[PDB]
Design a protein around this ligand. Structure first.
Ligand SMILES: Nc1ncnc2c1ncn2[C@@H]1O[C@H](COP(=O)(O)OP(=O)(O)OP(=O)(O)O)[C@@H](O)[C@H]1O
Ligand SMILES: [Zn+2]
Lengths: 525, 225, 228, 143
């Protein structure tokens, strides 16, 4: 059952029947929703032409994990920036039809004489449904003008709008971007929406400062709502709320007679109260308890911090405060280290976004989407580096990640089929970018081999003492080790490393075996 | 672990000490130095339990060592100054002496290096793990199961296992070459006995005074025809 | 004086100058036979550039009497020196810092094992957590070996007390297959079944498999000799 | 210094910065307050009463020591900060630089982490001990 065939079938059926009730229970709608649910969202290919410092490039992206490795001046963050531009258009069309996205501004084009325009090409694959988008911009004063092609994106976003129009519990894809400025964001220095909708997340793509404050407000509201569930309040509370809403409506009617801001505020409060009443009706129809979501978030954060016992909200000084118990000491959020603050903000933001975007799923941590992370190993000691990847791909298994790293320890825990190495090779006097793969499998090997193969760098420093050891080794292997010069070199080595060092012991073993080989040959000659 | 050949007693000032006086902390530095003189002689330069090097060939007091009693002081108080209860242990805060006293256990199921040969129970591996030999009865199997648990000599990863693996892999070149020569000799045609004898005595000469000497010995003899 | 100090810190460059072009102006750095715009530098080189520039700026102003102001006295504290640095850069930052300013006292904290391999063992302190008399308190120790010039994993294991080999699930079959081999049970059907998974994940030519085959041949020859 | 997360690596550096702040303030002018210890920085244990920091500065053979302390709620405190040793050194530098010009002064700098007349013609600011990296734009404009 191709997605397009069910889409056109529902489109042609919509025109005939005018009644919405029949459409809501139509068989075609059920088929479209069913085939939409298992359609995994994932990007396929990307290409760059004359964008910033990049001349040309073609990159194929895996569906589960991709890692970029290599140092150079063009900057790997540029590649992530290109992807951020493309996904912005997809989000805009979902919000409203034909809404403009993000254009390529003038100065990002290359400054070379023989350039005229810059282009970005991308492709999105959903099972057997393929779409492509091209975004381009030409220099000022060019003879020919270029325009973007938005047919595929508009068609893809129309399906989501159609499904979301008839069903109020539709799930939407997730897009996020974590730049390197989150280090300041997660500082949490000492600097109230009654209802939350899934459209709030679509306001911005890049992680920002206001997200932490929204996280605090959302946590407070969720805990307060779970308090009513704990109290097991009966339906009389709904009756009291209805009475208050009726009184507010009467006040609004009195206000309409013989204060525009007051009227707007009263109308907004009435709408919020009506939404709360509809939430109470859904409570009668039953739903996932706020307690289950509360401990789902708490346990999710606690999975990445094994050194903490519990996290709680304490009401004091007419305000709320987060208390974490480590060992036998209670601590505040501001007293944590930089690494724990970074992990706390990253996981909290991801959990909030996924929970808000899937109100209908029993386990909201299984939604689809794409997440781009830059410098995954910020403020992390080597012990945490070897387990961050496994925990990330185990808590959220249905999300595609794109990551750039700089540490061999992280690189030693990923498969060799997800590693792309970027190298600049000067050919014919012109530097060219190429992409290669590791020679051998690097998952499970020591971090020294991962540095030797995955990064192509010598894992041994070039200090002066290394030259002494190498020179002594050459003499030993060359069998004229018995000389005054070797004795002088050896005295230096013993003085620096010491006689008990394993490296010196290896050379001693090499001497001893060579001495024994002629002895045994002479014995049985 | 390795079997310890205790020499003639050398308690010295220990004999002058009295049980009724007690006051283990009252021992002066001179007595501690005298004790260490004999202890280093009997124990070599290796820890009794983990066999990590404890004394380095002569700026800082590296590898801090503390004198440990085999039995608990509280309930075997009569052996506070007993000569046979003296042992030397490293300063690692996660194993050996500093880890023995933090648990509750039966005192009759512990292996003593000066009484029974540890080679009967344990069998080391190239990767650095410890494997209990099969065919033992119930009481010996329980004894070997508990001594490793109390001494933390069999961790899941890291700890002493990583160090043992690194030490084993550093010395594998000598073992491979020695068995390479052995093969030749044998094939060519020479009195097996002779070959054996030599390949052993020489290896024992070249392995004396080294870190984790039993793990290397076990690996070598496993691959030595 | 500032420009020469930066040139001394990075000898790979020839000269640095500011050029006012026909319409623009920019700073040009020459290395070998190639001229590069200052903005083309990566984040790590920019961080090094501003760190050395600030240090030189303070030293010049504080010592107006000395002929060579780079011989002043003071103390400098640096936190997380290895931030935003490629591994090839981390292996030479300490020597250059300790050679450009030879009369300054440095206090540095770091996370990367690559930096540790270039530091002498007499200047290393390790912080641990131990409990004495029911109270948990911090403690400071020293490395037991010489870590200058050793490989990367040796420095990680001795100077940081961490396992250099990961505990991945794919590793789980490796030690089991090794253990079965060492017990002279390599011909068992379980070993044959496990070898399919290992050889599929790693491959025939991987060095780890090669050493396992060498051990197989050695044990087989020993068994052949013993049987006869 | 090598360690894991939450092991006080940044605590030591902040302690030294606290110690050096008072000496810098005394050098600039006699009897000038330095940097105090924040209330939240005190240990949260039940039996703690005050927090103290001690330091020793050795100049060839001359020696000096400075102690700074603050008590949160303990009834008994360790009197006040002992600044007698650092005032002699500050007066020494003031004396030497008062008579003979173009003198020399010690250098104190602290490159922290993200967190967050008098040769002022050049625009370099010596007042702030703390300095932050990844500010290449400002240094480019200064150059
Ligand atoms: N008031 C307090 N009482 C007790 N412990 C505290 C208090 N405030 C902070 N801590 C401890 O401080 C530790 C972190 O200290 P610190 O910031 O020095 O760590 P770090 O990892 O060395 O830092 P950085 O990443 O900045 O170098 C936490 O583990 C916490 O237990
Ligand atoms: Zn030990």
């Amino acid at each position: 059952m191709n997605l397009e065939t069910c889409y056109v079938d529902f489109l042609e059926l919509e025109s005939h029947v005018i009644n919405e009730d029949y459409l809501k229970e139509s068989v075609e709608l059920q088929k479209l929703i069913s085939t939409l649910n298992e359609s995994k969202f994932h990007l396929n290919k990307i290409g760059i032409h004359d964008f910033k410092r990049i001349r040309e490039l073609q990159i194929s992206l895996e569906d589960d994990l991709t890692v970029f490795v290599g140092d150079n001046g063009f900057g790997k963050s540029t590649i992530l920036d290109a992807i951020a531009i493309v996904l912005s258009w997809l989000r805009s069309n979902i919000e409203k039809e034909s809404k403009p996205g993000t254009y390529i501004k003038s100065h990002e084009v290359n400054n070379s004489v023989d350039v005229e325009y810059a282009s970005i090409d991308a492709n999105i694959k959903l099972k057997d449904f393929n779409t492509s988008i091209l975004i381009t911009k030409a220099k000022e004063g060019a003879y020919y003008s270029r325009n973007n092609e938005l047919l595929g994106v508009k068609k893809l976003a129309s399906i989501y709008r159609l499904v979301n129009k008839y069903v109020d519990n539709a799930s939407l894809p997730l897009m996020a971007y974590y730049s390197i400025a989150r280090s300041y964001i997660g500082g949490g220095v000492d600097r109230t929406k009654t209802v939350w909708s899934k459209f709030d997340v679509y306001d911005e793509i890049e992680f920002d400062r206001n997200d932490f404050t929204d996280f605090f407000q959302w946590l407070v509201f969720l805990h307060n709502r779970a308090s009513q569930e704990k109290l097991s309040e009966s339906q009389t509370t709904i009756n009291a709320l209805f009475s208050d809403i009726q009184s507010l409506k009467a006040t609004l009617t009195q206000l309409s007679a013989i204060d525009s801001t007051v009227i707007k505020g009263l109308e907004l409060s009435l709408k919020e109260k009506l939404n709360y009443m509809k939430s109470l009706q859904s409570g009668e129809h039953k739903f996932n308890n706020a307690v289950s979501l509360y401990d789902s978030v708490i346990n999710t954060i606690l999975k990445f911090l094994p050194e903490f016992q519990w996290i709680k909200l304490v009401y004091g000084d007419d305000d709320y405060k987060i208390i974490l118990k480590k060992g036998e000491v209670e601590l505040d959020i501001q007293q944590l280290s930089q690494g724990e603050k970074t992990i706390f903000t990253l996981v909290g933001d991801l959990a909030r976004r996924l929970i808000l975007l899937n109100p209908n799923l029993s386990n909201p941590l299984l939604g689809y989407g794409i997440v781009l992370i830059d410098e995954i190993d910020l403020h992390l000691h080597p012990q945490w580096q070897q387990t961050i990847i496994e925990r990330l791909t185990s808590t959220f298994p249905n999300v595609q990640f794109v990551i750039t790293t700089h540490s061999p320890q992280v690189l030693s825990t990923v498969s060799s089929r997800s590693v792309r190495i970027l190298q600049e090779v000067e050919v014919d006097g012109v530097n060219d970018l190429i992409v290669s793969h590791p020679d051998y499998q690097i998952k499970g090997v020591s971090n020294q081999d991962a540095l030797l193969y995955g990064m192509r760098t010598d894992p041994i420093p070039s200090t002066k003492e290394n030259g002494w050891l190498e020179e002594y080794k050459k003499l030993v292997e060359l069998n004229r080790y018995s000389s005054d010069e070797a004795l002088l070199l050896r005295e230096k080595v013993i003085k620096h490393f010491g006689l008990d060092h394993p490296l010196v012991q290896e050379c001693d073993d090499l001497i001893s075996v060579l001495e024994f080989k002629n002895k045994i040959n002479q014995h049985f000659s | 672990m390795k079997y310890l050949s205790r020499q003639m007693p050398g308690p010295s000032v220990l004999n002058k000490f009295d049980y009724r006086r007690d006051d283990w902390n009252s021992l002066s530095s001179n007595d501690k130095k005298e004790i260490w003189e004999e202890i280093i002689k009997m124990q070599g330069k290796l820890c009794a339990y983990c066999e990590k090097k404890i004394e380095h060939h002569k700026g800082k007091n590296k590898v801090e060592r503390h004198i440990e009693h085999f039995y608990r002081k509280s309930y075997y108080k009569n052996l506070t100054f007993e000569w046979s209860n003296l042992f030397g242990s490293c300063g690692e805060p996660q194993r050996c002496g500093f880890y023995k006293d933090k648990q509750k256990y039966n005192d009759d199921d512990l292996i003593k290096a000066d009484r029974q040969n540890p080679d009967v129970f344990f069998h080391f591996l190239e990767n650095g793990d410890v494997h209990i030999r099969e065919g033992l009865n119930e009481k010996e199997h329980k004894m070997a199961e508990v001594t490793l648990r109390v001494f933390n000599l069999n961790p899941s990863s890291g700890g002493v296992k990583a160090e043992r693996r690194r030490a084993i892999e550093l010395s594998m070149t000598l073992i491979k070459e020695l068995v390479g020569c052995a093969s030749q000799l044998i094939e060519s045609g020479c009195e097996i006995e002779d070959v054996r004898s030599m390949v052993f005595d020489e290896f024992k000469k070249n392995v004396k005074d080294r870190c984790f000497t039993t793990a290397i010995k076990h690996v070598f003899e496993n691959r030595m025809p």
